[PDB]
Scaffold this active site. Sequence first.
Site, PDB file in Angstrom:
ATOM      1  N   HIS A 165       0.822  -1.196   0.000  1.00 24.90           N
ATOM      2  CA  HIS A 165       0.000   0.000   0.000  1.00 24.90           C
ATOM      3  C   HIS A 165       0.861   1.252   0.000  1.00 24.90           C
ATOM      4  O   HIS A 165       1.799   1.373   0.788  1.00 24.90           O
ATOM      5  CB  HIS A 165      -0.941  -0.006   1.207  1.00 24.90           C
ATOM      6  CG  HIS A 165      -0.245   0.077   2.530  1.00 24.90           C
ATOM      7  ND1 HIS A 165       0.040  -1.030   3.298  1.00 24.90           N
ATOM      8  CD2 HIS A 165       0.202   1.143   3.233  1.00 24.90           C
ATOM      9  CE1 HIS A 165       0.631  -0.652   4.417  1.00 24.90           C
ATOM     10  NE2 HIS A 165       0.741   0.664   4.404  1.00 24.90           N
ATOM     11  N   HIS A 225       8.298   6.107  -2.669  1.00 21.46           N
ATOM     12  CA  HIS A 225       8.878   4.928  -2.053  1.00 21.46           C
ATOM     13  C   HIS A 225       7.788   4.040  -1.462  1.00 21.46           C
ATOM     14  O   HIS A 225       7.079   4.436  -0.537  1.00 21.46           O
ATOM     15  CB  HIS A 225       9.894   5.347  -0.974  1.00 21.46           C
ATOM     16  CG  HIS A 225       9.852   4.521   0.280  1.00 21.46           C
ATOM     17  ND1 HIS A 225      10.791   3.559   0.581  1.00 21.46           N
ATOM     18  CD2 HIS A 225       8.972   4.518   1.310  1.00 21.46           C
ATOM     19  CE1 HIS A 225      10.492   2.998   1.739  1.00 21.46           C
ATOM     20  NE2 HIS A 225       9.393   3.564   2.202  1.00 21.46           N
TER      21      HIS A 225
END
Length: 219
Positions: A71, A150
């Site tokens: 996620h 990221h």
Amino acid sequence: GSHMFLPLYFGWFLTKKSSETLRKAGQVFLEELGNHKAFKKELRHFISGDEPKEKLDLVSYFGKRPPGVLHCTTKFCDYGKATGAEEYAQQDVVRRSYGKAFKLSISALFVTPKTAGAQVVLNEQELQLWPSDLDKPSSSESLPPGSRAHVTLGCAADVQPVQTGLDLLEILQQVKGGSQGEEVGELPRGKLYSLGKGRWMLSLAKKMEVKAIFTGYYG
């Protein structure tokens, strides 16, 4: 005016089928890379453990939490407490983006003792979802932007919140100056670049595109 519930932060979850495809690819990418000829021969050179730790499998160390969780945590609203989230929350681009599905684009994979994930490139969608508050870095020294670029994949028991912050930002700086990624790990699907005397990265040959959905989760 009403008894409704709202999310904690906006993000793009990895649509199961995709989450799995990426979770395995990355997980295996870490163990396969960890068992490199240069790495294996440098096992001690990297970690001097001739008593406390003389056999610590990276998989178990950098893979404690279930890898089946992918996620991307865009902007944290924190119940609208962090302030500002509200202003951006109404963003026509973000507000309207929610509910829509989109595939992520990973340029390379990152590996760390207590952290490990994939690098995501911010395109038009992410660009529009970029608030004017994230324009200036932390120190405001033109530091390499991309605090959301990221995605998390693997973390150890020492995965500190402050370590991931500095290691993420600092590592981004070096790579920006063309000095953070030594080809010390050949991969059939690319190569591994030493992201620093402690970090590692993998440049995908055809990138890693997965299916995700934009939404906000509270708990």
